[PDB]
Amino acid sequence: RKTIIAGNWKMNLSLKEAVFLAHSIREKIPSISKDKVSMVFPSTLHLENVSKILEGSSVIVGAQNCYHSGLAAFTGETSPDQLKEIGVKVVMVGHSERRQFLGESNFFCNDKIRFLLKNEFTVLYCVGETLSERESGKTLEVLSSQIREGLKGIDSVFFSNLILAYEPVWAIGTGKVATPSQAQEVHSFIRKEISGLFVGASSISESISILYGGSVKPDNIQDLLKEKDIDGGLVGGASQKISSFAGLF
Amino acid sequence: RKTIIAGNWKMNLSLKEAVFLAHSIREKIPSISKDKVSMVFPSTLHLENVSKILEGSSVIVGAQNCYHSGLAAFTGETSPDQLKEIGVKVVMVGHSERRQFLGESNFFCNDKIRFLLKNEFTVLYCVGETLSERESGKTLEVLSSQIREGLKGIDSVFFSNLILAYEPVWAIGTGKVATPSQAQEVHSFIRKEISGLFVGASSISESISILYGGSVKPDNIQDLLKEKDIDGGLVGGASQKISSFAGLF
Numbered sequence: 335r336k337t338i339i340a341g342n343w344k345m346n347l348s349l350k351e352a353v354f355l356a357h358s359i360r361e362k363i364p365s366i367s368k369d370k371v372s373m374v375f376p377s378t379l380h381l382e383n384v385s386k387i388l389e390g391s392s393v394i395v396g397a398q399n400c401y402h403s404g405l406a407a408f409t410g411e412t413s414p415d416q417l418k419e420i421g422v423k424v425v426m427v428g429h430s431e432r433r434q435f436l437g438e439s440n441f442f443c444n445d446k447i448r449f450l451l452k453n454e455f456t457v458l459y460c461v462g463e464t465l466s467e468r469e470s471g472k473t474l475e476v477l478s479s480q481i482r483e484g485l486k487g488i489d490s491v492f493f494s495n496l497i498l499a500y501e502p503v504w505a506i507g508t509g510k511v512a513t514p515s516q517a518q519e520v521h522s523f524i525r526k527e528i529s530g531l532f533v534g535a536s537s538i539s540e541s542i543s544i545l546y547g548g549s550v551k552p553d554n555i556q557d558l559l560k561e562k563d564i565d566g567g568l569v570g571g572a573s574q575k576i577s578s579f580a581g582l583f
Numbered sequence: 584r585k586t587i588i589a590g591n592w593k594m595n596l597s598l599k600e601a602v603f604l605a606h607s608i609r610e611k612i613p614s615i616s617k618d619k620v621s622m623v624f625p626s627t628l629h630l631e632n633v634s635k636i637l638e639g640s641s642v643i644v645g646a647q648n649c650y651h652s653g654l655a656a657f658t659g660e661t662s663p664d665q666l667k668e669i670g671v672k673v674v675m676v677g678h679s680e681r682r683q684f685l686g687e688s689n690f691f692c693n694d695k696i697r698f699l700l701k702n703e704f705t706v707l708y709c710v711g712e713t714l715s716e717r718e719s720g721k722t723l724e725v726l727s728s729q730i731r732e733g734l735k736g737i738d739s740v741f742f743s744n745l746i747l748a749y750e751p752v753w754a755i756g757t758g759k760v761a762t763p764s765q766a767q768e769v770h771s772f773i774r775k776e777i778s779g780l781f782v783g784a785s786s787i788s789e790s791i792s793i794l795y796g797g798s799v800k801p802d803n804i805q806d807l808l809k810e811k812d813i814d815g816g817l818v819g820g821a822s823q824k825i826s827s828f829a830g831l832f
Contacts, residue, residue, distance in 0.1 A: 345655055378813065401684075406593070409647050409648070410680070420628070552754050
């Protein structure tokens, strides 16, 4: 099981800032990442640039979203054919901001995930429940649906290229705040749902990385990683400056 | 009233192809565009690149989509702040592929359009009805709604930066085929709806460019431009190779 520290740059950075961050990362992170996998997700407008900078390093670049098609007539969308051409082979699916602000359903996630995994991409699939869902007792039902419907029909032989993240959307500026034990109990559940997904899923459920996607910072990373089923972080704000990002490793 | 020939590269091109097309365009189109405005819309992954190539030329670059926010926490989205930084000041809203495959509503179009126009961008707003809408007699109701709800609350002083396109989605591989008179009667209607949008809209309705977005090719462009209310093209396939694109001017 890999430990992964993934920085999500969201739509927060200028191209100037992205390029400075990329160079800073390339100079520092490979020397301190050690056993941990380093990953970054720049805005699509900046991917080509950032990708050229990080070429030759151990820092993996991913896209924040894509559409489930090769080159074709889909105005506004990015194709995995376009990403592959610039060496980007990781794509994020189902981020809470996309589910909430862009109306992405489990089913649209599933079509992305099927396409990406069939075509040799790594997928970083995000799940998580809102405060209203949690307050209504729907944590289990929502997570279980996100996993089952998100991963429906995916050939088990492709799960080696699937990474999960749990976003405690309920604590995300709500301002409930999530403890490492609260995160742990969700990660254990999620891992148990993977173990039930298809016949013979026992080994895959134990090797799959499940990253924590709530608030992750140098001051709480070690406490999160100590939890048995937490395998890293999908990190927001702290990933967007070199000093905080480097502090995670 | 400007005549505009806008090429939509959709998600159809590799970065290699986009860069070759950009250089080809820069070398040829400025010498033949003459009175016509030339515009291109590359995939977002390629915009930085293409934008650098076309810098200093008369060929205008636009984005195929964006979100209605400055830099902020919207995973997967592109900000007009990011576009402005690389000199892209035109954004397309409401393309039929986005309405159909990405579920974009009139209201989500309206929020994009309000944000873009408030912040000194030019907007290329696409409208059009499906075969089922047309067959049901909803052409008027659909177009009228797309315009009224799309442009709700937009300060009239910003309409100078609004361009329209009509996509005859009903004829778009359906395979009904649209004549220049059929296009004309829609463009005249659309122009009449703009003239009713706000008090004193008479002059703006006569100066606004309304581009035809059905099948546009060197062999039918002159027949389309002869129609009284057709002011250019938003062009798909023919825009994606230099010889066909140059044939439009």
